[PDB]
Amino acid sequence: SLLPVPYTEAASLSTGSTVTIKGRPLVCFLNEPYLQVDFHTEMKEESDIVFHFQVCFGRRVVMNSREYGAWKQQVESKNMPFQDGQEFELSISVLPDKYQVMVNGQSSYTFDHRIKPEAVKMVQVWRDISLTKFNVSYLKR
Amino acid sequence: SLLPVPYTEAASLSTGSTVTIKGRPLVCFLNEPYLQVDFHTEMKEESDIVFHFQVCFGRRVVMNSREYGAWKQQVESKNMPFQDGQEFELSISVLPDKYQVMVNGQSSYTFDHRIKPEAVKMVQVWRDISLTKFNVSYLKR
C-alpha cells in the first residue's frame, strides 16, 4: 500500500531510539505469510545483520544475527500477539542491554545486543506485508 | 513489476495444460527470498491446495497438498536450477500422472497427482518475486 516493500531506509540507532512499523499481512494466517525486519551494518542487502526478526504469522518468530556473512545462534519464540487479518503496530526500542519488541503496545520479545546498535546503518522491512508507516525516533543524542 | 503480487488468476487445468510464469527474485539469495505457486480448489485463498510449490531460493524446494484444511505429506528437493539475481522461466505441465516442472527449459521437479487437476479453479503466485508474465495454455480440450 503506502510504502513500497521491500522497504529500505538509511538509519542510525543508539540507546533510546525506537523504530515503529505499521502494516498488515497480505494473506490469511492459514497460508503462513512472513514479515521480516533486518537491521544491517551497510546500505547493501548482503551486508551483516545486527538484528534479524522474522515472523511466520500464526506459527513462530525467529531472531538472530548474521556476522561476517554467517548466521549465528537462532533464538525462537512461539509467542504470537499478531491477529489474523489485522493491521499491526510493531515498536522496537533500543535499550542499553537489548532490543525490546512491542506488538500493539504489548511487550512480546527481547533480544540481547550481540553487536552495538551504533553499527546499524540501514533497516529493511520485507516479505508478505503491506506497509503503511515507518519511523525511526531521532530525538535523542 | 508488470503484474501485481500476490497474483491470483481463475484457471482450469487438464492433461496437456501448461502454466508459464516468468519473474525475478526481489532480493539476493543470501537473504533467502521465497517463491510460492499454489493451485487452489476455489477462488478463495483459504481453500484447499491441489499442488503447493514453494522455493526457498538457494536452499530447497517443498511440495505438498492441503486437503480439507490439512497439509499432507511434504516432499522436499535440494535441486536448485535457479540463478541468483536472474530472471527465471517456470513451466508446470500437467501430465496424466503428474505435474512436471521445468526451470529455464530444464526438467527439475515432478509431483504425482493427489487430486485430479480438474479440481483446480485458481492459481496464486506470491512471496518475494516480481512477476512479468503469467499464462495458462487453453488450447487443449
Coordinates of C-alpha atoms in Angstrom, one line a residue:
Chain A
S1 CA 0.0 0.0 0.0
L2 CA 1.6 3.3 1.1
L3 CA 5.3 2.4 1.2
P4 CA 7.0 0.0 -1.2
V5 CA 8.1 -3.4 0.0
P6 CA 10.9 -4.4 0.3
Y7 CA 11.3 -1.1 2.2
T8 CA 14.8 0.2 2.8
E9 CA 15.7 3.2 4.9
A10 CA 19.1 4.5 6.0
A11 CA 19.1 4.8 9.7
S12 CA 21.2 5.4 12.9
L13 CA 20.4 3.9 16.2
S14 CA 21.5 4.3 19.8
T15 CA 20.1 3.8 23.2
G16 CA 16.7 5.4 23.4
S17 CA 15.9 5.0 19.7
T18 CA 12.6 3.5 18.6
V19 CA 11.6 2.0 15.2
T20 CA 7.9 1.9 14.6
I21 CA 6.4 -0.1 11.8
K22 CA 2.7 -0.2 10.9
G23 CA 1.4 -2.7 8.4
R24 CA -0.8 -5.6 7.5
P25 CA -0.2 -9.3 6.4
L26 CA -1.0 -9.7 2.7
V27 CA -2.8 -13.1 3.1
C28 CA -4.6 -15.1 5.8
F29 CA -2.6 -16.8 8.5
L30 CA -3.5 -20.2 7.2
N31 CA -1.2 -19.6 4.2
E32 CA 1.7 -18.7 6.6
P33 CA 2.7 -15.2 5.4
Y34 CA 6.0 -13.9 6.7
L35 CA 7.3 -10.5 8.0
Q36 CA 11.0 -9.8 8.2
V37 CA 12.8 -6.8 9.7
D38 CA 16.6 -6.7 9.4
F39 CA 19.0 -4.0 10.9
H40 CA 22.0 -4.0 8.5
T41 CA 25.6 -2.7 9.0
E42 CA 25.8 -1.3 5.5
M43 CA 23.4 0.1 2.9
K44 CA 23.6 -3.1 0.9
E45 CA 21.3 -6.1 1.5
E46 CA 24.1 -8.7 1.5
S47 CA 25.7 -6.9 4.5
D48 CA 25.8 -8.2 8.0
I49 CA 22.7 -8.1 10.1
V50 CA 22.9 -6.8 13.7
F51 CA 19.3 -7.8 14.5
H52 CA 17.2 -10.2 12.2
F53 CA 13.5 -10.5 13.2
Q54 CA 11.4 -12.9 11.2
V55 CA 7.7 -13.7 11.9
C56 CA 5.9 -16.6 10.3
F57 CA 2.4 -15.4 11.1
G58 CA 0.5 -17.8 13.3
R59 CA 3.5 -20.1 13.8
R60 CA 6.6 -18.7 15.3
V61 CA 9.2 -15.9 15.5
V62 CA 12.9 -16.3 14.8
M63 CA 15.7 -13.9 15.8
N64 CA 19.4 -14.0 15.0
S65 CA 22.4 -12.0 13.7
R66 CA 24.4 -12.6 10.5
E67 CA 28.1 -11.8 11.3
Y68 CA 30.8 -11.8 8.7
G69 CA 28.4 -13.5 6.4
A70 CA 27.4 -16.3 8.8
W71 CA 24.2 -16.8 10.7
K72 CA 24.7 -17.1 14.5
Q73 CA 22.6 -18.7 17.2
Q74 CA 19.0 -18.6 16.3
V75 CA 16.5 -17.7 19.1
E76 CA 13.0 -19.0 18.5
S77 CA 9.7 -17.9 20.2
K78 CA 6.2 -19.2 19.9
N79 CA 4.7 -16.1 21.4
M80 CA 2.2 -14.8 18.8
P81 CA 0.4 -11.5 19.5
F82 CA -0.4 -10.8 15.9
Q83 CA -4.0 -11.2 14.8
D84 CA -5.2 -12.8 11.6
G85 CA -6.2 -10.2 9.0
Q86 CA -5.4 -7.3 11.2
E87 CA -3.2 -4.3 10.9
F88 CA -0.4 -4.4 13.4
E89 CA 1.9 -1.9 15.1
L90 CA 5.4 -3.1 15.8
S91 CA 7.8 -1.0 18.0
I92 CA 11.4 -1.9 18.5
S93 CA 13.1 0.0 21.3
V94 CA 16.9 0.1 21.8
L95 CA 17.6 -0.4 25.5
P96 CA 21.1 -0.5 26.9
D97 CA 21.2 -4.2 27.1
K98 CA 18.7 -5.3 24.4
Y99 CA 16.1 -4.6 21.8
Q100 CA 12.5 -4.7 23.2
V101 CA 9.8 -5.5 20.7
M102 CA 6.2 -4.4 21.4
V103 CA 3.3 -5.7 19.3
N104 CA 0.2 -3.5 19.6
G105 CA 1.6 -2.0 22.8
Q106 CA 2.4 -5.3 24.4
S107 CA 5.9 -6.3 25.3
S108 CA 6.4 -9.5 23.3
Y109 CA 10.1 -10.3 22.5
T110 CA 13.6 -9.1 23.6
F111 CA 17.0 -9.8 22.1
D112 CA 20.3 -9.0 23.8
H113 CA 22.7 -7.0 21.8
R114 CA 25.3 -9.0 20.0
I115 CA 26.8 -6.0 18.2
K116 CA 26.5 -2.4 19.3
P117 CA 23.3 -0.7 17.8
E118 CA 25.7 2.0 16.6
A119 CA 26.9 -0.3 13.9
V120 CA 23.4 -0.2 12.2
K121 CA 23.3 1.9 9.0
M122 CA 20.1 0.6 7.3
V123 CA 16.8 -1.1 8.1
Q124 CA 15.0 -3.3 5.6
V125 CA 11.3 -4.4 6.1
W126 CA 10.1 -7.1 3.7
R127 CA 8.2 -10.3 3.0
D128 CA 4.4 -10.7 2.8
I129 CA 3.0 -7.4 4.2
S130 CA 1.7 -4.1 3.0
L131 CA 3.5 -1.2 4.8
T132 CA 1.6 2.0 5.9
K133 CA 4.1 3.6 8.3
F134 CA 7.8 3.5 9.0
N135 CA 9.5 5.8 11.5
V136 CA 12.8 5.9 13.5
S137 CA 12.9 8.2 16.5
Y138 CA 15.8 10.8 16.1
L139 CA 15.0 12.9 19.2
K140 CA 17.8 11.5 21.4
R141 CA 21.6 12.1 21.1
Chain B
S1 CA 6.9 -5.1 -11.8
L2 CA 4.4 -5.9 -14.5
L3 CA 1.8 -8.0 -12.6
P4 CA 0.8 -7.4 -9.0
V5 CA 2.0 -9.9 -6.4
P6 CA 0.2 -11.8 -4.8
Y7 CA -1.1 -12.6 -8.3
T8 CA -4.4 -14.6 -8.5
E9 CA -5.9 -15.9 -11.7
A10 CA -9.0 -18.1 -12.2
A11 CA -7.9 -21.1 -14.2
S12 CA -8.9 -24.5 -15.4
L13 CA -6.5 -27.4 -15.9
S14 CA -6.5 -30.8 -17.5
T15 CA -4.0 -33.1 -19.1
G16 CA -1.9 -31.1 -21.6
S17 CA -2.3 -27.8 -19.9
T18 CA 0.8 -25.7 -19.1
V19 CA 1.3 -22.8 -16.7
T20 CA 4.2 -20.5 -17.6
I21 CA 5.5 -18.0 -15.0
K22 CA 8.2 -15.5 -15.7
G23 CA 9.7 -13.4 -12.9
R24 CA 12.7 -12.5 -10.8
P25 CA 13.6 -12.8 -7.1
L26 CA 13.3 -9.5 -5.2
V27 CA 16.5 -9.8 -3.2
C28 CA 19.8 -11.8 -3.3
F29 CA 19.8 -15.5 -2.5
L30 CA 21.9 -14.8 0.6
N31 CA 18.7 -13.3 2.2
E32 CA 16.6 -16.4 1.3
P33 CA 13.7 -15.0 -0.7
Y34 CA 10.8 -17.4 -1.4
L35 CA 8.6 -18.0 -4.4
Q36 CA 5.3 -19.8 -3.9
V37 CA 2.8 -21.2 -6.5
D38 CA -0.5 -22.7 -5.2
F39 CA -3.2 -24.4 -7.3
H40 CA -6.4 -23.9 -5.3
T41 CA -9.8 -25.7 -5.5
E42 CA -11.8 -22.4 -5.0
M43 CA -11.3 -18.8 -5.8
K44 CA -10.5 -18.1 -2.1
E45 CA -7.1 -18.3 -0.6
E46 CA -8.1 -20.4 2.4
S47 CA -9.3 -23.1 0.1
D48 CA -7.6 -26.5 -0.5
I49 CA -4.4 -26.7 -2.4
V50 CA -4.1 -29.4 -5.1
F51 CA -0.4 -28.6 -5.7
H52 CA 1.7 -26.4 -3.4
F53 CA 5.2 -25.5 -4.8
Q54 CA 7.4 -23.4 -2.5
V55 CA 11.0 -22.4 -3.4
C56 CA 13.4 -21.0 -0.8
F57 CA 15.9 -19.7 -3.3
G58 CA 19.4 -21.2 -2.8
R59 CA 18.2 -23.7 -0.2
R60 CA 15.4 -26.1 -1.1
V61 CA 12.0 -26.7 -2.7
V62 CA 9.0 -28.0 -0.8
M63 CA 5.9 -29.6 -2.5
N64 CA 2.6 -30.7 -0.9
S65 CA -1.2 -30.5 -0.9
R66 CA -3.6 -29.1 1.7
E67 CA -6.6 -31.3 1.8
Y68 CA -9.7 -30.5 3.9
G69 CA -7.7 -27.8 5.5
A70 CA -4.8 -30.1 6.4
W71 CA -1.3 -30.2 5.0
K72 CA -0.4 -33.7 3.7
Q73 CA 3.0 -35.4 3.1
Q74 CA 5.6 -32.9 2.2
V75 CA 8.1 -33.8 -0.5
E76 CA 11.4 -31.9 -0.3
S77 CA 14.0 -31.4 -3.0
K78 CA 17.5 -29.8 -2.9
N79 CA 17.7 -29.5 -6.6
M80 CA 18.2 -25.8 -7.3
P81 CA 18.4 -24.6 -11.0
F82 CA 17.5 -21.0 -10.2
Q83 CA 20.3 -18.5 -10.5
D84 CA 21.0 -15.7 -8.1
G85 CA 19.8 -12.3 -9.3
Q86 CA 18.4 -13.7 -12.6
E87 CA 15.0 -13.7 -14.2
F88 CA 13.6 -17.2 -14.3
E89 CA 11.1 -19.0 -16.5
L90 CA 9.0 -21.7 -14.7
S91 CA 6.7 -24.1 -16.7
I92 CA 4.4 -26.5 -15.0
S93 CA 3.0 -29.2 -17.4
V94 CA 0.0 -31.3 -16.4
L95 CA 0.8 -34.9 -17.5
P96 CA -1.6 -37.8 -17.0
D97 CA 0.3 -39.0 -13.9
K98 CA 1.9 -35.9 -12.5
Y99 CA 3.0 -32.3 -12.8
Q100 CA 6.3 -31.7 -14.5
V101 CA 8.2 -28.5 -13.5
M102 CA 10.8 -27.1 -15.9
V103 CA 13.1 -24.2 -14.8
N104 CA 14.6 -22.4 -17.7
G105 CA 13.8 -25.3 -20.0
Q106 CA 15.3 -28.0 -17.7
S107 CA 13.1 -30.7 -16.2
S108 CA 13.7 -30.1 -12.4
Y109 CA 10.8 -31.5 -10.3
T110 CA 7.8 -33.8 -10.6
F111 CA 4.8 -34.3 -8.3
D112 CA 2.3 -37.1 -8.7
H113 CA -1.3 -36.1 -8.7
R114 CA -3.0 -36.4 -5.4
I115 CA -6.3 -34.8 -6.5
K116 CA -7.4 -34.6 -10.2
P117 CA -6.1 -31.4 -11.9
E118 CA -9.7 -30.7 -12.9
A119 CA -10.4 -29.7 -9.3
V120 CA -8.2 -26.6 -9.8
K121 CA -10.1 -23.3 -10.1
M122 CA -7.5 -20.7 -9.2
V123 CA -3.7 -20.2 -9.2
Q124 CA -1.9 -17.9 -6.8
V125 CA 1.7 -16.8 -7.3
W126 CA 3.3 -15.0 -4.4
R127 CA 6.2 -14.3 -2.0
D128 CA 9.4 -12.4 -2.8
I129 CA 9.3 -12.0 -6.6
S130 CA 8.4 -9.5 -9.2
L131 CA 6.2 -11.1 -11.9
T132 CA 6.5 -10.2 -15.6
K133 CA 4.4 -13.0 -17.2
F134 CA 1.7 -15.4 -16.3
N135 CA 0.0 -17.7 -18.8
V136 CA -2.1 -20.9 -18.8
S137 CA -2.4 -22.8 -22.0
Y138 CA -6.1 -23.1 -23.1
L139 CA -5.5 -24.8 -26.5
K140 CA -6.4 -28.4 -25.5
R141 CA -9.8 -29.8 -24.6

